[PDB]
Design a protein around this nucleic acid. Structure first.
Lengths: 44, 49, 76
RNA sequence: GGGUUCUAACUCAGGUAUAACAAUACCGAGGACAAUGUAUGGUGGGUAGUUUGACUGGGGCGGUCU
RNA sequence: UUUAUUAAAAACACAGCACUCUGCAAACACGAAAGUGGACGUAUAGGGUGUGAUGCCUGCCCGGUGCUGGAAGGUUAAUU
RNA sequence: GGGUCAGCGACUUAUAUUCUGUAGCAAGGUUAACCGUUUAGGGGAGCCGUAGGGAAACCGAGUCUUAAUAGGGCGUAGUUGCAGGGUAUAGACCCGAAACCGAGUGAUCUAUCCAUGAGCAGGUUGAAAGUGCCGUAACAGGCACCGGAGGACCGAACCCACUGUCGUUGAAAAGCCAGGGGAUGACUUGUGGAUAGGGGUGAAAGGCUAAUCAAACUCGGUGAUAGCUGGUUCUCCC
RNA sequence: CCUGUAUUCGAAACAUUAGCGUUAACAUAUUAAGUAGGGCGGGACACGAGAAAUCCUGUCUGAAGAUGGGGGGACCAUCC
RNA sequence: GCUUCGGGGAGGCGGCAAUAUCCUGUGAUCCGGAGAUUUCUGAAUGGGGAAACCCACUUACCAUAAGGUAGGUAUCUUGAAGAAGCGAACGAGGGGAAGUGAAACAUCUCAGUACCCUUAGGAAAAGACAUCAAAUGAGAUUCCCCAAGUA
């Protein structure tokens, strides 16, 4: 059973990175929503 | 377009006379190739002088 | 963009209205054309993306007047 | 009242120069056509929003609705 | 090759055949446009459709709906 | 429908309007916003009642229709607060959809593709081509050697999933065992990347798109709507 | 009983508010044309093209300019 | 946690959470004003990047070794000065649904609402009549109560 999740830090960092979020304008809005909510972990 | 003739050209008029031409004819051929000037006071004075 | 520089015309929004009076959102685009205007004061052709009303404004006011208006407005 | 011709608008997803794209200058090829903006007739399940009644010895079918 | 997790098959695909479109800025497709694939290809090439190795073959009908060509006549929008 | 107990749980609020009760004034009643050293006082704009008839002009205890002055139709104690019953607009007594729309997150699973690497024990079979000999007028043809093609054969790893038992609150939200198919290819696999929802991808099953697919997931419109189901809590009297 | 309350009150330093003074940045029209109005298609006006006044404009057009022009809900005349 | 300027006068070295060494009338702890220091990431701005990491160039000085100290090196706009990014609601503008109601549904409603985008200020917008009115005429804009659920 190759299960749904299979971790790879390189792909995880590229897909959910802080820099990737900053690159797109919309992702900055997601980061701002995390900050407004007060979540400690903004990004993986 | 009202325009002053800078040279004889067929079927339009004499030298210096003010004619009415189609806007395309006046804008694309005559004025760009220096055969006429737009009809304004500042150009009629220039030509008459 | 699809904007007339001389007069600032840009796409308008409106409705396509059917005979049954159904409404659908639509756009009204300006009659924009590329035209090389001859300018004697600089002895050169300047290419503008201009509307038909813009070309009429060139005809009525002069390329020099319109060009100085654009330079005051900004982009040149 | 239609055609033919021309070029100067316009086009080149053609050549040369511009380091490369693009633009520009010239040449060349088209040319008042093409293309685009508004209006307008046609076509258009390609895509949408919907409708497709009731009675009924279950429903459908048949029959009926004043 | 296929319905991951009740169907592996006669289903899909397949080489082969046929029709049709496309002269290149091709047709076709994504995209609002730019820009792309087609293709740094050029009718022995590319797209769509149907059939499905091979052997023997593939009869009749254009009335209906499509497609191709034609405009003699009727009708016909904005506009004027 | 409820395993039992304890706690929470469903007719409310705002405004408008009608009727009733009560209180103050009474052919009159009352102010709103605002001012206000603000529950006082001021503020008469405005609202209801006191007159109706007709579509209206218009008239008025009358008026409309009509040629009619006949006939006929319609006519000839309220108001402001408080409280209560009902209704109207809002979620409107509470809970409950499958759905639709907007914006974002997803190709670490899976579908295809792109780039770059890796893997396929062992054993067989013997195409074209080639060499030599004979032979042909030259062709052709025949034999022997050689050769190593194949979406070629048998069979492990690897990939798959045809049959049966077991398991089915499983060791496992799809497995184990015994058999089975491919196994140099249209093959398998590692890493990175590309295609995003009426969209993608699909050798096509409406298959797959993060255990979710005839339209993914998250949030928002949203307390969607539900002529439907369920529930709706103290007492006594007529 | 303590901290408090009524009452009276302190600022070296910095902020803020107002008044005045001064500086340096910008601005300083001179009566209004592609404008009013009009055709087509839409939109907003309580107003859904309606007899539809009034406003905005994508397209095509286009004045008078004070002896003139706009409005007064189609429209004409008078009046404001 | 440091310096300074004021307040204060006997305790104190933040809390879980105490212990030890200690400080404090040479005014400590504590409060208020100002200043200094302020690693790295983040608009991040020397280039790059998988945020808290990699690699640099250059000016001056110092060292003689394989370095240290202080700076400069993003982009855009305007002609050296600005801007970028973040953050409640309100304002203005550019786009703009559908559930729903009509007991169906397409006009209509929902509604110019939700949502997306852009951009300010303490407010914004509007604002002085090419506005109403037709009464003896009034005299910008904005908001509240009526007019009136009337036309």
């Amino acid at each position: 059973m190759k299960r749904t999740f299979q971790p790879s830090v390189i792909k995880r960092k590229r897909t959910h990175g802080f820099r990737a979020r900053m690159a797109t304008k919309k992702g900055r809005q997601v980061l701002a929503r995390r900050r407004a909510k007060g979540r400690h972990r903004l990004t993986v | 377009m009202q325009i002053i003739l800078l040279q004889r050209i067929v079927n339009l008029g004499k030298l210096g006379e003010t004619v009415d031409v189609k806007p395309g004819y006046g804008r694309n051929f005559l004025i760009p190739l220096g055969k006429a000037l737009p009809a304004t006071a500042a150009n009629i004075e220039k030509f008459e002088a | 963009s699809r904007v007339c520089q001389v007069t600032g015309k840009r796409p308008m929004v409106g409705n396509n209205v059917s005979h049954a009076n159904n409404k659908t959102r639509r756009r009204f685009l300006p009659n924009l054309h590329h035209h090389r205007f001859w300018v004697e004061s600089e002895n050169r052709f300047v290419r503008l993306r201009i509307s038909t009303k813009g070309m009429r404004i060139i005809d009525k006011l002069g390329i020099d007047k319109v060009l100085v208006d654009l330079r005051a407005q900004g982009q040149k």
